Amino acid sequence: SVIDPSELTFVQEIGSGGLVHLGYWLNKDKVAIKTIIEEAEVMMKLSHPKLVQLYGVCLEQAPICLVFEFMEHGCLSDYLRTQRGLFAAETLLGMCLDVCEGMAYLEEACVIHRDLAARNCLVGENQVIKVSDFPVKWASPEVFSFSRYSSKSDVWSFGVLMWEVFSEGKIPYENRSNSEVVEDISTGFRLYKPRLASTHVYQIMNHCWKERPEDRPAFSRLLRQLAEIAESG
Numbered sequence: 001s002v003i004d005p006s007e008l009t010f011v012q013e014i015g016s017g018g019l020v021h022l023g024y025w026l027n028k029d030k031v032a033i034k035t036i037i038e039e040a041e042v043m044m045k046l047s048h049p050k051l052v053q054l055y056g057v058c059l060e061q062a063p064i065c066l067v068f069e070f071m072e073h074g075c076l077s078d079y080l081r082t083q084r085g086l087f088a089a090e091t092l093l094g095m096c097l098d099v100c101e102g103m104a105y106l107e108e109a110c111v112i113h114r115d116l117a118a119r120n121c122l123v124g125e126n127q128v129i130k131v132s133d134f135p136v137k138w139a140s141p142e143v144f145s146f147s148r149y150s151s152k153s154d155v156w157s158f159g160v161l162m163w164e165v166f167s168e169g170k171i172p173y174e175n176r177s178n179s180e181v182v183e184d185i186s187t188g189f190r191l192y193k194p195r196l197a198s199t200h201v202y203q204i205m206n207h208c209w210k211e212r213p214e215d216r217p218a219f220s221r222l223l224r225q226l227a228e229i230a231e232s233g
């Protein structure tokens with residue numbers, strides 16, 4: 001990236017030797033603008049390298065809009081379908097590990113995602129995966145039966161996300177109606193093991209898919225568990 005000199009303002013000399021200067025930079029930076037005061041300011045304090053940053057809110061004129069971070073390669077769902085077969089098992093695990101880092105920060109700050117999926121996960125420079133936007137195929141039994149949301153209901157969605165990643169962007173419960181999904185999941189049916197997913201990785205998905213929400217592990221526990229798989233093989 002080349003920067004035009006006129007965009008920069010030099011204010012003070014900070015460190016001598018080249019010469020380091022405190023300066024200001026006015027630039028037209030690429031952003032993602034979501035179109036429609038208090039709930040918008042609590043989202044701004046939430047900063048993490050694995051979460052899509054909210055830069056600000058435009059309120060002076062209608063429609064009001066939120067200014068988010070721009071991710072160079074768009075949503076993960078399409079990214080996996082487009083570049084199918086090009087990914088290694090480690091790269092796919094590393095994608096789940098990036099999402100888990102962000103979700104561990106969100107659960108620590110007591111924030112429920114309510115729609116965690118590959119479509120809401122974005123790919124940036126050097127294949128960084130970040131979580132954004134904070135569907136019975138991603139919904140846990142307590143969400144489609146009692147509408148009870150928690151970090152444990154997000155853990156079920158993370159299990160479906162992991163599956164989506166290892167199946168390389170495949171649609172979960174394909175050629176199955178919403179009602180058919182609900183009855184089968186409740187019976188004990190789960191998404192099959194994707195070829196690229198290890199036997200142990202599939203067990204973690206099934207741990208995320210435990211009918212009892214408290215039986216499911218936390219994102220803090222999933223982060224340790226997944227990183228351990230990345231170190232061993």
Ligand SMILES: CN(C)CC[C@H](c1ccccc1)n1cc(NC(=O)c2n[nH]c3cc(-c4cn[nH]c4)ccc23)cn1
Binds near residue numbers: 052074075078133
């Ligand atoms: C490379 N392909 C995947 C297609 C390129 C696609 C695009 C670009 C221009 C016109 C049409 C399609 N593309 C999209 C992005 N970026 C984003 O989609 C994006 N980048 N940052 C985002 C933040 C949110 C967001 C929603 N709620 N909170 C944040 C939602 C979406 C985004 C990068 N390339």
